[PDB]
């Protein structure tokens, strides 16, 4: 009850006369709604991961994935998952988020070169074949492909860049066949200080596991809430209004009440922000409707007591809130502090300081005893 | 006098987030201090008037 909350706040079993800012009240969401676009065609992950031929590591294939539902459960079917390293995202949460764009960098490397496919790594493949950005967000999936990328006489169709003048920049592909030059003497052909940058892998089944070919696909994501586009397989629900709910608008998670908006978004605009960069409005992915977002009602809770030795009776002030909203939240049981004070009808008063419950408003004027605010004071009187 | 302001620490730092609130519990009584200071400021404003 409020008196016990005051006792715990003061850390004393005895409470003196006064008003104590004890806790905070909050209206709780009643439903959880998610709005996801009409898109239903599954992303072509099978084509990228089960391609007949994979490009060389120095010529890594960047597939573009957009405008589809990214169901990652398919990836668990045709993959032994030797490496499943997700950086910046949780692999278990991939099914709930919205990604602006998907980039699939697919290539084939050696078994021991898998660890080189990571931001901040060093090595032949990392520096001269494929380099990831320092702020890379996404996942890297590496799996053995010896049964499909090895030949008895040697698979020379796969080449890697071993020599280069400078280390490869992130998301940079080098396909130049110029002979590497060591020093200042120009190179006109194979010979002294001249080496071919591209070396054939020569994958063979008889080789060891560390030398067996491995297919590596890097899924790069642009986790932005404005363009949405590619999201996971979540069933969109109906849209409720004028009710405090947990909303998931195309990956944007929040809590509040959504109302009709007079804001006129330009066609390219997807959401609205306030002077202090707080989200004021959103656009429904389905109905293209402009919805104002208002966080659910909350505020301070103060307890007025005459002193625990005078009486155990208390009054509660919910600060800066209309008595109607407090009563409505109590009716639906949405208030965070759940020790509801008994309401009689004369026990509920509306001050400019908020809603006062448990104190009877009289028309007489006395000297202030317990300051409530806005000229309103409380006192324990007959 | 000046404007009397009240701050909810949990809302400001870890708004309706339970994980953040549990992490914030590790920092001790900084926020009780802040609330006490703001309450003293407000009471002083009323006393000034």
């Amino acid at each position: 009850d409020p008196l016990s909350e005051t006792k715990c706040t003061l850390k004393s079993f005895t409470v003196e006369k006064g008003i104590y800012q004890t806790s905070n009240f909050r209206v709780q969401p009643t439903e959880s709604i998610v709005r996801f676009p009409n898109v239903t065609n599954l992303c072509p992950f099978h084509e990228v991961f089960n391609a007949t031929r994979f490009a060389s590591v120095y010529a890594w294939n960047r597939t573009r994935i957009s405008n589809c539902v990214a169901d990652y459960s398919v990836l668990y079917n045709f993959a032994p998952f030797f490496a499943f390293k997700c950086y910046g995202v949780s692999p278990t949460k991939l099914n709930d988020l919205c990604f602006t764009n998907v980039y699939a960098d697919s290539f084939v490397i050696k078994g021991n070169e898998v660890s080189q496919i990571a931001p901040g790594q060093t090595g032949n493949i990392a520096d001269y074949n494929y380099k990831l950005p320092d702020d890379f967000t996404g996942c890297v999936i590496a799996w053995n492909s010896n049964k499909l990328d090895s030949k008895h006489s040697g698979n020379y169709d796969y080449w890697y860049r071993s020599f280069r003048k400078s280390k490869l920049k992130p998301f940079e592909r080098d396909i130049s066949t110029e002979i590497y030059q060591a020093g200042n003497k120009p190179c006109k052909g194979k010979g002294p200080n001249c080496y071919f940058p591209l070396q054939s892998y020569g994958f063979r089944p008889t080789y060891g596991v560390g030398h067996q070919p491995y297919r590596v696909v890097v899924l790069s994501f642009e986790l932005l809430h404005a363009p949405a586009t590619v999201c996971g397989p979540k069933k969109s629900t109906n849209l409720v209004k004028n009710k405090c709910v947990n909303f998931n608008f195309n990956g944007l998670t929040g809590t509040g009440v959504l109302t009709k908006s007079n804001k006129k978004f330009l066609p390219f605009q997807q959401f609205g922000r306030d002077i202090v960069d707080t989200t004021d409005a959103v656009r429904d992915p389905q109905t293209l409707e402009i919805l104002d977002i208002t966080p659910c009602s909350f505020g301070g809770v103060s307890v007025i007591t005459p002193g625990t030795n005078t009486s155990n009776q208390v009054a509660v002030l919910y600060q800066g809130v209309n008595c109607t909203e407090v009563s409505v939240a109590i009716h639906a049981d949405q208030l965070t502090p759940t020790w509801r004070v008994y309401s009689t009808g004369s026990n509920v008063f509306q001050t400019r300081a908020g809603c006062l419950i448990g104190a009877e408003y009289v028309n007489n004027s006395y000297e202030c005893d317990i300051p409530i605010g806005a000229g309103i004071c409380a006192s324990y009187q007959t | 006098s000046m404007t009397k302001t009240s701050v909810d620490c949990t809302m400001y730092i870890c708004g309706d987030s339970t994980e953040c609130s549990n992490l914030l519990l590790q920092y001790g009584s900084f926020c009780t201090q802040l609330k006490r200071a703001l309450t003293g400021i407000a009471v002083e404003q009323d006393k000034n008037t």
Binding site: I275, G299, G373, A374, G375 | T5
Partner: peptide
């Protein structure tokens, strides 16, 4: 003379009214 106010109230920052209203201050004066 004393939205920004809505946003300030939107994350834990509330403003408490003074105990004495402007009418009472005018009465005292």
């Amino acid at each position: 003379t004393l939205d920004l106010i809505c946003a300030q109230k939107f994350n834990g920052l509330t403003v408490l009214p003074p105990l004495l209203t402007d009418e009472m201050i005018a009465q005292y004066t």
